[PDB]
C-alpha cells in the first residue's frame, strides 16, 4: 500500500502542475494583448515537459498578471507567505473590478447609439458579481482548506472592497453579499462571527465611524444563519456557541446606539437612516434573545419533543 500511495501522490502533484501549465499556455496564446512574436516562444517552452512551479510563476503567470493562476500556484507549492497571498488577492479583486466596469461601459454605449473602440466585441454582471465569480472558481479548485483562504484576512479585504466601491444598495445589490458568498462557499458560521467581531473591535478603515453600521448588519446576518443552522442540526439529530456571541450582540447594540446619536447631531441636518437603524436594533435584540435562550438550556433540549 505504501508503494501504491507514493506513486499515486507523485502523479497527483504532477497532474496539478500540468493543469496549471495548460491553463497558462491556453490563456497566453489567446490573449489579445500578447504580441505574436512572443506567443510562438511561449508555445515552445510550455507545450512539452512539465515545468517547475517557480518558472510557471515568475516567467509566465506573474508577467501576464494572471493572478488567479498565481493563487493556484501558491496552493500547489504549499507557499507559506500570507502577505504575498493577500497582495495577489488584492490585485485579482481590483483587476476584475476594472474589467467588469469596462464591459458595463461598452454595454451602455450600445444602448445609447455610440460606437465602441475598434475591435471590441459588443447586461454584463455588476462588478461585485464578476468578482465573487472569481472567488468561487478558485475556491472550488483549491477546496477552501488552502492557505490561500485565510478567512481572517480575506473576508475583511472583500468587505473593504464592497464599501470602498459602493457595491451596496445604491446599485441594487444585497448589502450582505460578502457574507452570503463565504457562507455558501462553506466557511463555518463560528469562524465568520469570530472574524466579524475582530473587524468591529479594531475599527480599521474603512470599518470606522458610522460605516460600522454595515459591520453590525453583517454580524446580524451571520449570527442569524448560525442560529438557523443550530436549530436545523437539532431537528436533524432528533430524527460551538458561547456567551461571547451574546456579549458580541450587546456591544453591537451599543455601537448602533452610538451611531444613531452621532447621526442626529451631524452638521447640515440629521441623518436619513434613523428608522433603518431602529430596525437593525430590533433584529439584533431578537438575535440576542434567541442566542440567550439556546445558551440558557434550549440547546441541550433540541432533540426533545416540545
Amino acid at each position: 500500500r505504501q508503494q501504491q500511495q507514493q506513486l499515486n501522490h507523485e502523479a497527483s502533484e504532477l497532474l496539478e502542475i500540468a493543469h496549471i501549465q495548460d491553463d497558462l499556455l491556453e490563456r497566453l496564446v489567446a490573449d489579445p494583448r500578447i504580441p505574436e512574436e512572443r506567443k510562438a516562444e511561449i508555445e515552445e517552452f510550455l507545450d512539452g515537459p512539465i515545468r517547475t512551479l517557480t518558472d510557471l510563476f515568475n516567467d509566465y503567470a506573474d508577467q501576464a498578471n494572471y493572478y488567479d493562476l498565481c493563487l493556484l500556484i501558491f496552493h500547489a507549492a504549499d507557499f507559506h507567505n500570507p502577505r504575498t497571498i493577500m497582495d495577489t488577492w488584492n490585485n485579482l479583486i481590483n483587476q476584475s473590478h476594472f474589467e467588469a466596469e469596462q464591459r458595463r461601459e461598452y454595454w451602455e454605449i450600445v444602448q445609447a447609439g455610440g460606437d465602441l473602440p475598434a475591435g471590441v466585441i459588443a447586461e454584463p454582471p455588476l462588478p461585485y458579481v464578476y468578482v465573487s465569480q472569481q472567488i468561487q472558481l478558485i475556491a472550488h479548485r483549491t477546496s477552501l482548506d488552502s492557505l490561500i483562504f485565510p478567512v481572517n484576512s480575506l473576508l475583511p479585504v472583500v468587505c473593504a472592497y464592497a464599501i470602498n466601491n459602493g457595491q451596496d444598495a445604491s446599485i441594487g445589490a444585497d448589502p450582505c453579499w460578502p457574507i452570503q458568498l463565504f457562507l455558501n462557499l462553506g466557511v463555518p458560521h463560528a469562524l465568520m462571527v469570530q472574524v466579524l467581531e475582530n473587524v468591529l473591535d479594531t475599527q480599521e478603515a474603512p470599518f470606522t465611524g458610522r460605516r460600522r453600521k454595515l459591520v453590525v448588519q453583517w454580524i446580524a446576518m451571520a449570527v442569524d444563519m448560525w442560529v438557523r443552522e443550530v436549530e436545523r442540526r437539532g431537528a436533524m439529530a432528533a430524527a460551538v456557541m458561547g456567551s461571547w456571541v451574546s456579549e458580541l450582540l450587546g456591544r453591537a447594540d451599543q455601537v448602533l446606539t452610538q451611531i444613531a446619536g452621532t447621526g442626529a447631531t451631524l452638521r447640515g441636518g440629521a441623518a436619513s437612516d434613523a428608522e433603518e437603524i431602529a430596525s437593525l436594533r430590533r433584529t439584533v435584540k431578537g438575535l440576542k434573545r434567541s442566542v440567550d435562550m439556546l445558551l440558557g438550556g434550549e440547546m441541550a433540549r433540541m432533540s426533545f419533543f416540545r
Binding site: 473591535d201 470606522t208 465611524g209 458610522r210 460605516r211 460600522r212 453600521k213 453590525v216 448588519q217 454580524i219 449570527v223 456571541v245 456579549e247 458580541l248 450582540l249 450587546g250 456591544r251 453591537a252 447594540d253 455601537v255 448602533l256 446606539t257 452610538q258 444613531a260 446619536g261 452621532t262 447621526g263 442626529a264 447631531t265 451631524l266 452638521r267 441636518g269 441623518a271 437612516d273 434613523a274 428608522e275 437603524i277 431602529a278 430596525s279 437593525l280 436594533r281 433584529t283 439584533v284 435584540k285 431578537g286 438575535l287 440576542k288 434573545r289 434567541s290 442566542v291 440567550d292 435562550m293 439556546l294 440558557g296 438550556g297 440547546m299 432533540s303 426533545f304 419533543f305 416540545r306
Partner: protein, 480 residues
C-alpha cells in the same frame, strides 16, 4: 530616504535658464520637468530674517530682532517647541484662564526654560535689551511690519481660470512669510516670559502676540499637513478671487501675499474646518487649540471620527447623517453614532440613549439593545417593557430560539397574557415537550399525551407525578 529625497530634489532643481515672467519676475527653469524656482524680492522683515549675521547698520527694530535671535539661537529645538506648546496652551485654556499672566509665564519658565540656557547669554541679552525703547520698537513691529493692511482692493488681477503656478508660488511665499513671522513672534514672547516686563502695560501686545503666534502655528501646521487642501480653502476664502490671481510685477505679488497674510490674521477657520471634514491628527492639536457651543460640537464630531467625544456631547446637549441629525435637533445622535461604528462606543451611546428615552423608534431601539446584549436578562426586560407590534416580538423570539430558554426559565422562577400565548405558540412551533411543560408551569399533559399517541414509561410517570381517573388509566396502560 532623507538623503535621497534631498539629492533628488537638488538634481531636479539644477538650473538651466532664466525666464522673465510678467514684466519683471525672475524665474529659473530647472532640469526636471515641472520644476521651477521663482526668485522673490524680499520684504523688509524678510530682509531682516535673511540678513541677521550681516547687516552692518540696520534700524532699531532690526538690531532688536538680531539680539533676540542672538539669545534664542542658543536654545535647542526641544526647548523652543515646549515653549511654543505652552503659548498655545495659554490660548487653549490648558493653562487656565484663571491664572494671571505672570503665573502662566512662571509656569512656562519653570517647566521649559529653567536650567536650559547659559546665564551668560541671559546677561548679554539683558544688556543689549536695555538700549532699546521697547514700546516703540514693538509698536512698529506689531502694528506696521507684521499686521498687514486694510485693502480697498489694490488690483490683484483676478484669474479667470485656475493658475496652478501662481497658486503654488503664492502658497510657498505665504509659508515663508509666516514662518519668519513665527520665529520672530516666538522670540519676542520668550523675552516676555524671561524678564519683568509690566504685564499690564504690554498686556495688549502680549495678547496680540499670543494671538498671532497661534495663528502662525496653525497655518504652518496645515501647510505641511495638506498643501492642496490648504491652498483650496485659502483661495476659496476670497470670493472675487475664488479661482486664483495673476501678478505681473513684484509689487503685485508682495501685495497679494500680504493680502493672504491679512486673511490668516483676521470665516476662514469655519470654511476650512468644513471643507476638511467634508488631516485627522492635526485637528486634534487644533481642536484642543483652534476650538478655544459650536466649538463643543466640533470637538465632539472630530473626536469621534470615543470616551471624550461622548462625554463632551452629553455635557453640551457621514456628512449627510450629520446634516440629518442637525435637522432633527439626543436619540438621533446616538443612533447615528451607533450606525457609524457598526463598536464599544456605539453600543454604549445607543444603550444610554435608549435608557434616557424609556412605534418604529421604540422597536428599533429594543432590537438593537437585545442584539448587543446577546452578543456581549435583556430579553426578559425588553419583553416585560413592550408588553406593559406582536409579530415583531414573534420574530425576535424566533431569533432567540439555549440562552433564550435559560432566560425564560429564570423569568418563570422569578414569577414563582399576550406574552404567555406568544410563548406557548412559539414552543409548539423530549426538547419540545420539556420546554412546553416548563412554560405552562395542563398544556404539558396535553402535549405529552399527544406525543405518546422507555419513552412510554417515562411519559406515563411524568404525567402521574404532575397530576399528584387519569392516573388509573395510565397505570392500566403501563400494565397492559
Amino acid at each position: 530616504l532623507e538623503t535621497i529625497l534631498r539629492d533628488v530634489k537638488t538634481a531636479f532643481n539644477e538650473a538651466s535658464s532664466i525666464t522673465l515672467y510678467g514684466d519683471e519676475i525672475i524665474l529659473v527653469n530647472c532640469f526636471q520637468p515641472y520644476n521651477h524656482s521663482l526668485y522673490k524680492l524680499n520684504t523688509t522683515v524678510e530682509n531682516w530674517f535673511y540678513n541677521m549675521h550681516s547687516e552692518t547698520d540696520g534700524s532699531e527694530l532690526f538690531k532688536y530682532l538680531r539680539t533676540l535671535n542672538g539669545f534664542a539661537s542658543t536654545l535647542s529645538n526641544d526647548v523652543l517647541r515646549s515653549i511654543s506648546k505652552k503659548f498655545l496652551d495659554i490660548i487653549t485654556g490648558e493653562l487656565p484662564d484663571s491664572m494671571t499672566t505672570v503665573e502662566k509665564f512662571t509656569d512656562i519658565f519653570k517647566n521649559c526654560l529653567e536650567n536650559q540656557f547659559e546665564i551668560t547669554n541671559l546677561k548679554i541679552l539683558f544688556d543689549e535689551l536695555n538700549s532699546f525703547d521697547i514700546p516703540v520698537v514693538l509698536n512698529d513691529l506689531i502694528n506696521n511690519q507684521m499686521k498687514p493692511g486694510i485693502f480697498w482692493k489694490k488690483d490683484f488681477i483676478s484669474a479667470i481660470k485656475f493658475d496652478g503656478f501662481t497658486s503654488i508660488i503664492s502658497l510657498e511665499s505665504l509659508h515663508q512669510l509666516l514662518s519668519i513671522h513665527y520665529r520672530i513672534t516666538l522670540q519676542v514672547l520668550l523675552t516676555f516670559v524671561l524678564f519683568d516686563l509690566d504685564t499690564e502695560i504690554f498686556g495688549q501686545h502680549i495678547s496680540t502676540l499670543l494671538d498671532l503666534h497661534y495663528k502662525q502655528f496653525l497655518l504652518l501646521n496645515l501647510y505641511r499637513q495638506d498643501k492642496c487642501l490648504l491652498a483650496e480653502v485659502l483661495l476659496k476664502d476670497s470670493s472675487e478671487f475664488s479661482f486664483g490671481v495673476k501678478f505681473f510685477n513684484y509689487g503685485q505679488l508682495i501685495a497679494y501675499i500680504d493680502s493672504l497674510n491679512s486673511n490668516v490674521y483676521n470665516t476662514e477657520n469655519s470654511f476650512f474646518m468644513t471643507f476638511f471634514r467634508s488631516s485627522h491628527k492635526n485637528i486634534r492639536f487644533f481642536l484642543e487649540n483652534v476650538e478655544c457651543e459650536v466649538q463643543e460640537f466640533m470637538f465632539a464630531m472630530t473626536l469621534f471620527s470615543f470616551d471624550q467625544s461622548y462625554e463632551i456631547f452629553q455635557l453640551h446637549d457621514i456628512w449627510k447623517d450629520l446634516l440629518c441629525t442637525f435637522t432633527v435637533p439626543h436619540s438621533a445622535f446616538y443612533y447615528q453614532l451607533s450606525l457609524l461604528f457598526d463598536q464599544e462606543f456605539a453600543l454604549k451611546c445607543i444603550s444610554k440613549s435608549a435608557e434616557y428615552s424609556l412605534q418604529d423608534f421604540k422597536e428599533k431601539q429594543h432590537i438593537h439593545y437585545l442584539n448587543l446584549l446577546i452578543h456581549f436578562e435583556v430579553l426578559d426586560v425588553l419583553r416585560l417593557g413592550h408588553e406593559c407590534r406582536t409579530n415583531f416580538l414573534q420574530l425576535l423570539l424566533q431569533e432567540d430560539i439555549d440562552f433564550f430558554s435559560t432566560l425564560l426559565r429564570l423569568c418563570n422562577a422569578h414569577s414563582d397574557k399576550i406574552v404567555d400565548s406568544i410563548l406557548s405558540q412559539n414552543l409548539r412551533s423530549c426538547f419540545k415537550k420539556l420546554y412546553c411543560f416548563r412554560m405552562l408551569n395542563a398544556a404539558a399533559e396535553v402535549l405529552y399525551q399527544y406525543i405518546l399517541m422507555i419513552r412510554k414509561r417515562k411519559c406515563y410517570l411524568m404525567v402521574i407525578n404532575v397530576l399528584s381517573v387519569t392516573l388509573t388509566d395510565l397505570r392500566d396502560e403501563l400494565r397492559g
